[model samples]
Target chain A: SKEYGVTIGESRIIYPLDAAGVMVSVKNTQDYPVLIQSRIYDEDPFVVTPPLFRLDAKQQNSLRIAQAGGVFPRDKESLKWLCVKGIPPKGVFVQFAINNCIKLLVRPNELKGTPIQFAENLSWKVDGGKLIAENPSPFYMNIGELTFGGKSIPSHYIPPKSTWAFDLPKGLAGARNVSWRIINDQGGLDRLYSKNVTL
Target chain B: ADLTASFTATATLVEPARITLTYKEGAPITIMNGNIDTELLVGTLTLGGYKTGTTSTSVNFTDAAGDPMYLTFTSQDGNNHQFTTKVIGKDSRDFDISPKVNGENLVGDDVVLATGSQDFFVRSIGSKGGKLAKYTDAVTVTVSNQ
Candidate 1:
């Protein structure tokens, strides 16, 4: 099994409009020391502080992510990947370097309404051996789970003002009810939503 | 003498714990761990024959805010023939590991993190005939609540 050397404070990060940047905690959990590094994977819009450093065992440090790029979308949320990697000291044997990459969402202040409101208003229907989901709101609708006709369908994000069609499982042609749950701002499942097939 | 008075009690609800990735026992998850074999990495293989190396790690979801999460992979250098990630003890029904690029290599795939803890296996696929040089590929693992 692979050994982990560090832990992150939050699973998801949000960059608010007014704030210059966001701070995240990186802690070393191993008994020995490790070299911890942080960066945005590619085409990064933000800068990471202390991009490389050595942390003693059981010690924690803070990483500041600040915007360093041009203007993003003003009407919707933009996304990027924040990658934090841990490198072990060279040993006689081979060692693997692991990275924890999480999503960073850039939200504009002028955007109206909470994510919950937009999630509650999502539109869905079943048509022609597929499930049709439409998101007309400005916020990103994070889906926690989705089921159609008692069969669980792979869940996916419904972007703002976009419509997506997912293929249904075989023998679900006669199914009527479509139910789903959404992930809240804190990454928790908010509630359950169910709808009947259209037409 | 007697006195009469009225009292009111009010309570405020605080925010719940935020979702975070942690090791076992609720420790925070800061960095991911992987391993590379020195021999395979040092370069020795037969043409048309393949060698596979593995990197293993386990991830635990704390606070259950996101009961289920999604893990995706993207090659940093656009080289897909060198690396692939597979979730241990899962099938395509709940786990999806497929080629995202067109006949190049598997560049992207999504897996369902329905359980509290899941083990990840990253395989380093090798072929000796193509190139004879030490290569390090950075694969970006992106985790999401959706």
Candidate 2:
């Protein structure tokens, strides 16, 4: 298949709000020399150190994500996208480079319960012609899958203490079954949670 | 005699059966003297008739490895003056790796990669026009099993 330029340690970085920041391990997996570059997007409160540098073939480095002092709500987690790129030396006229983008979640100091505790407590209801899923905890929920009326409903991240609603498609308006799965801190999907609707 | 130009390309695999992005081996691409556009070229030229050249290579993935992956391009020099990189695939639809239009130069804004190896292309738009010399820059590639 295809090869990626660099390997990153974590699928997601959950940085404690009270700490300085976090470090992500990066390595140059190619045989040729390369330039390793780090970046953070969306004017977030964090900055990456050694924004750009050179890495010999098969060398490794750690990127420091230091907070630049941007403010976020204390009630829930915040997200920023981090990109660490690998560029090959331009010995030849033209070439290609690759990079990885990972989710950096700035989490507040201490919250109520664990992500699993909150995930299991999520509420579901059908109201106002829409099917709704509500998250009542302080942690953000990463949805691996969501289904209604035995049909897959496209899904992903669901913000903390927020409700995600989908229009009741005519074919599934009276759907009585709702099931879902969430991604845990280890980047693995947890067990499935299924519910029944009276509508 | 009229001047003719061309360039050759090669690729590497982390391992034989893992996800490998192999560039097809074929005849070198034909190069032109001045600014021009083609399915295989992206160039920026100066009024002095100098050429800041960029070329494309056809790439594809195979033997899927790694749970999730992504690819992104950035100007090697931090400044957009030297060169810029971008990628495009078969369809014109919304892409995971969006190209960095001329002015917005930064990384992390990436084009996502599919687990199944797919066909795509990468091009570098050169900006080293006035200074006549062989220019060099390095691209970093990173991978993590976690």
Candidate 3:
């Protein structure tokens, strides 16, 4: 569905590891038929069904995806890049090749609510022009834009229970007690988490 | 995970991935009302108090739900012709219009609107000494979710 819009199943996909397979649906928000194709890149066994097909105007279609059991960590989430491509009708005046890429997260059953819990206890240190975070919690965090020491830099994600490092903005390494905010799943910013993390 | 990552999986959108907008009946429209205006001629195109409502017309459009859609107005006859186009609302959509322009007849403006059925006008006016001639002028309007 085009709205400059791309949020599958009315939102993002969050599939559990044990299910037989997940059904992926796509909307054709055009006036005519749209040939749709799905592809999974950078990984294996996160299989997508009907890798290629067509959708009539104002119609929506569903596809199947699954993964054979593997030794994936049962305590954290795994990410995959699923790309959906739409090819417009042949008798078109102008065509925009729509390529929408969204994250496919394979979540371990026990990690529920761990991401939020992880964010609550984040700790940091600085060295070598980078900020190293000790993520002692079992879940991963999607870090949003951060404000610190009068400078702003892009955000990053920290894998669960890991020692993560990220590039720091100019002069941030020398700034004491960085205060930051993270974007929540609902697309809003979290409360300020203030700390004096001296390098 | 880009922080914003989730997906039940994405790339091809189901319903959440569409921002579509198009003209209904499929063609750029030319408003019509009775006689005095011919297919190839603006003939006896009346203006001012002597004019008939039948002499004026507008372009109509029907766009399905496409957020942040915008409409553009362009004066097609080059700058030599100067005129104004008034945007009158067709249905009930978010409508705001700056009614006049003084350019070389061919000027363009973009107006953003909320999603739903939208209707507006492109009425020609000559406030700057009335462009007079058995002249040919060009004007065009386009609505798109850019």
Candidate 4:
């Protein structure tokens, strides 16, 4: 029997707990086998970390990491960025990295920490190893608190993209505005891509 | 010796009778209870009555004994009825009995003659009051002894 290869070039956004995971489906377009390694970054010259999950190029795979524990932060002083790098023949991957601390890339006002919310900021970059910050895709991320007891709480902000609502303490307060940046590692321009909730 | 045989048959409202005789070397004789309106030369004898407006009458015959023998009469309706008649023996003289419809001889019908002791004359009888008309014909057979 002849083997038929399939290619699925779609990227899915996954919100696992307080972490966000990008499910990049690396399809086999040829009859031969291929391998893919994923890397994450906050910005250029600042390598955040590799994904905390595994992915396969021959099969659909996903990479996930906590947005708070990594270099990406909602605070202006600690503001960071995120991007995905695709190692072709190595497939595609998302990178979360940042170079220098910057002011609010976008306003996070009206986003309460008690009620989680989300935003998406996407952009495109050439493979020349430069951050072409212009012509970036707009995406959002909502950060909220997950309550454990009346006063006891989890220190990390919950990703709102995981569910419609998050139950937190009545008076607990924190920064609810979260910033997200998406960079396409492939040099191909005008390649359309989007990310949304897995649920 | 000349062996002559005759048979008579009569018919009534109920049953009809037939008589037949077979010789050793000659043709058989046949007689019917009702009128033998046709010639009787032998093979089989059939006796039956005709229809008369929902009722069947009787037929009588006088044998060689001068006594009348009553025969059964029947209708074409399939219900056979017998009628009473005077009986006759073989000692009486032979005579021919003819059937009449309203006192007229029925012609061209079959009549069978039956004889006793293998010889003599046979007579057929009709119903009383002439309500049932009998056939008027005679059939005779001659047997030869080799």
Candidate 5:
């Protein structure tokens, strides 16, 4: 009578750079067969647009940076990174961009100083746990007051917050840090979106 | 649907007649012993007729083949006596002899008797024994394959 038995075996980080990969093994110890599906979500629990790839049963599959679309190389300055692993019945690995800016452009005088903060309110759901989102590094930006000689005048900008982290579930099989929204003073009206960046 | 047929025959009993009574497929025959206290010892009856030369203390009947005919005995003595009867083929024959009991007592007196000769007539339809026996005039019957 029990439907199935699942076990999570060894999981190792494939490459640890801007784009990281992981290899995990899952064993089906039940008499019946089971189908596994992988999914990722943003900080607000909304399902991420691009889908995660799933490995079939009895598979010792690997999730690597190169296969995830290679936008970020294994370089020192790369901000985007990928983290992959396996969860027992369902697995979730996450790929995230570390330090990023939420852009808001308006009048010339208002563009003089743009304040940037760590977007902590962003959250993601995995195979059922919560992980706090944190930026791997700090971010820097510049703001311009006006245009001179058809060129914009640039002013040095200081970020109010350095790191960003999202609450994500632990022990997920496959996870992708899809999107994040600003939820502080600007509230629901401020939106910063990105595409699926490969490791 | 005239589902009826009839037959008549005359017989003579010499020494002791061996009547070869034949019956139709669904005909009925009744055998009776009229002499009171005169039980029809059917075991003494045989095929063809009663025996002619044998002079035992009992009257016995045999068939034309001289085989001991199958007979059935009905006695009011209230004793367990096997009286079985048998029939042969389509034109098969059998015989019966009534017990001889002479000197009947009185009417409705059970007609207890000593030792004497008893006569029984057999026809396809029934049998009639002499009045000296303890039965009604004749026992009519309708025989069937059952």
Candidate 6:
């Protein structure tokens, strides 16, 4: 009973961490009324506007997620995961394929910088049996595969100009080297031109 | 007079985009776009063949020649990387005989297309995977200018 599609204007929204408001857009290609809903988990950073709304077919809507001013930190950047779901309007059933859910990365404005700058200023060290990640730049970095002593652990995040600490795992007696990688905005790890850190 | 901005859409399954090909383990097949000048890669087929080593058919898409009728894809969604384009409907190995854009093996990424217009050509091997399934898929190409 339906035959249209919807598309997002931007891959992700860049939130001004220090500001009071932020917004992003979603566009439809045909007669699909996509309803968008949003929120951040645990950390209530900002007031996300209109928790829900319907996008008319072949139309574009800009939904705003604003700041109430004194919430998120300004000096360091923070990241959050956003879920945008595109569902079929009533009466129109896809039968086999009806809807999809996608992930969006939300970062504060204080973390605005080039990807390389994020890579350059990313440094890590071990102190008191804890591995500390110091991000001194203005970009949010998603860490993947923290490898030490040939062993590895999954994922982590570091805010801009901030530090994230972790307890060093077992088996690092004479650990001569350590390695880390940053997961890109896309699911793919920047394996090739990736910034591989070693110390 | 001011002009209102809007467009209509339709999505139809004229032919089946689903297919099955016998490829060596790790080998991938290319589905070419045949409506334009240069045959571009429209789709690629790869499979993790049956773990038991013997199968009587191909990986089938939801429904083939007899599913939901094609509708005018009027959502204004063009050749969007985000929208669903690739689906399994099976067995287009294709009733037509044409030179393949990728006659041999290729990775899934080599094939590319522009947003204006495009086509799909399901490529497959003679047989070993044996008998492909029948299905329906319309050649829906969403191009854009604005």
The segments of candidate 3 whose C-alpha lies over 4 angstroms from its true place after superposition are A1-7, A90-96, A171-173, A179-192, B1-146
Q: Mind giving the per-residue lDDT tens digits that candidate 5 earns over A44-91? A: 121212224444555533322222433322212222212222222320
Best candidate per TM-score, number? 1
- Please give the range of 10 consecutive residues that has the lowest summed lDDT in model 6 chain A: A91-100
Query: What are the lDDT scores of the predictions, listed in order?
Result: 0.53, 0.53, 0.45, 0.25, 0.24, 0.39
Candidate with more favorable, higher DockQ: 2 or 4: 2
Q: Per-residue CA lDDT of candidate 1, range A4-36, in tens?
A: 434666655778865788888887766768788
Candidate 3 chain A lowest-lDDT run of ten: A1-10
True contacts kept of each: 0.10, 0.16, 0.12, 0.00, 0.00, 0.00
Off by over 4 Å in 2: A1-3, A91-94, A124-132, A149-154, A165-176, A197-199, B1-146
What clash count does candidate 1 reach?
A: 10
lDDT of 2: 0.53
Candidate 5, residue A193: how far the Cα is off, in Å: 36
Q: C-alpha displacement of A165 in model 6, angstroms?
A: 9.4
Off by over 4 Å in 1: A41-44, A91-94, A126-129, B1-89, B92-111, B119-145
Q: Cα lDDT for residue A64, model 1? A: 95
Tell me which of candidates 3 and 4 scores higher on lDDT. Answer: 3
Q: Please tell me what DockQ candidate 5 reaches.
A: 0.00
| Candidate 2 lDDT tens digits, A33-52 | 77888887651478888899
Q: Is candidate 1 or candidate 2 better by TM-score?
A: 1
